[PDB]
């Protein structure tokens, strides 16, 4: 392996990719046969533009944008994370489940946030939900833009906000919202920040507590934890990041001079402070998908081959495009016994878990409590299940909040249009005499039949 740091940046990942394709660049230094990465969808898009040129397979573990499913432009992209379409539809289901129609949307200005928020907008207009504001954010965003977004959130009466963004891209916005103490919003989180340590920090709870977010299906990697604690800046020579990891873990330099004898368990860092391995299991499955493709190459038969006239490539002189081909016809069983089969776009269908941000009674941290799930293997309308008694709204409350633009019109009253406002924003207009309204949120007033007249309250007909 040759593993690099991207720093969530296109430039670093592109330098690493140029390192990967050096032999190919000379053709058009070891030969990278496949690449595992990357996390951000813009990063993976830039990397796939280059790796797909040389037909080097690229199996990502976190990039979940739908744009990466276009196999004409991304010829050699696979992923072990599911696509973002189901997640946007799932947030549309969540809003339609708690009976809201007046929500706002915030998205990272990148290939992750924008397509997901666009799919959410389509699903919302399909489910008769009104979107008040649609704001774009980035981690490298000026204070003017963040202040404008905060003003919009304040100038709005939408308690529910849908946020397609990562942790870093959302962080400045959350900082400015906390600094102004904007309490009382209901945050719906995509997978990228629903468990982010940059946002789920205890000093933001009054703003972000009670967040309802999505998580991937946890996996099992037996022995991975003991492997994690075996890290050492000197016992690990291949892992050049181990030195800086140790330095940042123990606040020392190889700052006090380090000892090389500190304990990993002494410090509390996300390195071993995990309860589920979700993206880590995606990395595990990326590596095992590549290995099982290579094994498929290694156990081929002269009459049964994916290539021309059933020919089998030799594993001693295997090329990257052959591993790509064997990754398009891959079907292997996991350690947990599930089958991993990439579709015609290299996407791995997967369930979602719905978590809620609750404060820790003892530690004071933010605990992610599974409150529901989203079953992508079920028909539309029966995919969501949320157990509403496990949800603490805003982190402390028990009452499902109100996020409609206008209060419901009682019986005997109709809906009236406020021009310059969406359809969900209506006023209540008393029915004229002789016309009744026996329902809640009725559009027009119903006329009484012959030999019949409306009540005093205009709710029904009396002879």
């Amino acid at each position: 392996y040759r593993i690099f740091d991207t720093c969530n940046t296109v430039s670093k990942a592109l330098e690493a990719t140029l390192s990967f394709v050096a032999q190919n660049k000379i053709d058009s230094i070891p030969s990278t046969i496949a690449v595992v990465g990357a996390t951000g969808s813009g990063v993976s898009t830039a990397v796939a533009n280059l790796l797909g040129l040389f037909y080097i397979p690229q199996v990502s573990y976190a990039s979940s944008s739908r744009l990466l499913s276009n196999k004409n432009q991304f010829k050699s992209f696979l992923r072990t994370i599911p696509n973002d379409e189901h997640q946007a539809t799932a947030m549309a289901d969540i809003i339609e489940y708690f009976r809201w129609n007046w929500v706002g949307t915030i998205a990272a200005d990148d290939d992750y946030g924008r397509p997901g928020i666009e799919k959410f907008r389509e699903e919302a207009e399909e489910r008769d939900i009104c979107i008040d504001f649609s704001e774009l954010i980035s981690q490298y965003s000026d204070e003017e833009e963040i202040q404008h977004v905060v003003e919009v959130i304040q100038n709005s009466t939408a308690k529910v906000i849908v946020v397609f963004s990562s942790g870093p891209d959302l962080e400045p916005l959350i900082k400015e919202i906390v600094r102004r103490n904007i309490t009382g919003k209901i945050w719906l989180a995509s997978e990228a920040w629903a468990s982010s340590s940059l946002i789920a920090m205890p000093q933001y709870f009054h703003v972000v507590g009670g967040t309802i977010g999505f998580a991937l299906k946890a996996g099992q990697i037996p022995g991975f934890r003991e492997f994690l604690k075996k890290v050492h800046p000197r016992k690990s020579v291949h892992n050049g990041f181990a030195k800086e990891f140790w330095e940042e873990t123990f606040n020392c330099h190889l700052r006090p001079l380090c000892t090389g004898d500190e304990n990993i368990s002494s410090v509390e860092t996300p390195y071993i402070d995990y309860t589920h391995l979700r993206i880590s299991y995606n990395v595990y499955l990326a590596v095992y998908s590549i290995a099982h493709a290579l094994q498929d190459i290694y156990t081929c038969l002269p009459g049964r081959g994916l290539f021309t006239n059933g020919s089998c490539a030799d594993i001693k002189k295997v090329e990257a495009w052959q591993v790509l081909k064997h990754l398009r016809h891959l079907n292997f069983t996991n350690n947990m016994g599930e089958q991993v089969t990439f579709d015609e776009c290299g996407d791995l269908v997967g369930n979602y878990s719905i978590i809620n941000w609750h404060l820790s009674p003892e530690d004071g941290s933010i605990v992610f409590k599974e409150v529901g799930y989203y079953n992508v293997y079920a028909k539309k309308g029966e995919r969501l299940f949320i157990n509403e008694e496990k949800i603490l709204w805003s982190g402390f409350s028990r009452e499902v909040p109100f996020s409609n633009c206008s209060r419901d019109c009682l019986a005997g009253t109709r809906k009236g249009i406020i021009e310059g406002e969406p359809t969900c924003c209506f006023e209540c207009v008393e029915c004229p005499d002789g016309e009744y309204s026996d329902e809640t949120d009725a559009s027009a007033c119903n006329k009484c039949p012959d030999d019949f007249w409306s009540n005093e309250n205009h709710t029904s007909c009396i002879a």
Partner: peptide
């Protein structure tokens, strides 16, 4: 890139991870 995890082998797998947030 000076910071890099390399181990030699018959078949080399590339890797891309965000060891730094930005």
């Amino acid at each position: 890139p000076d910071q890099r995890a390399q181990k030699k082998g018959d078949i080399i797998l590339g890797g891309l991870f965000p060891i730094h947030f930005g």
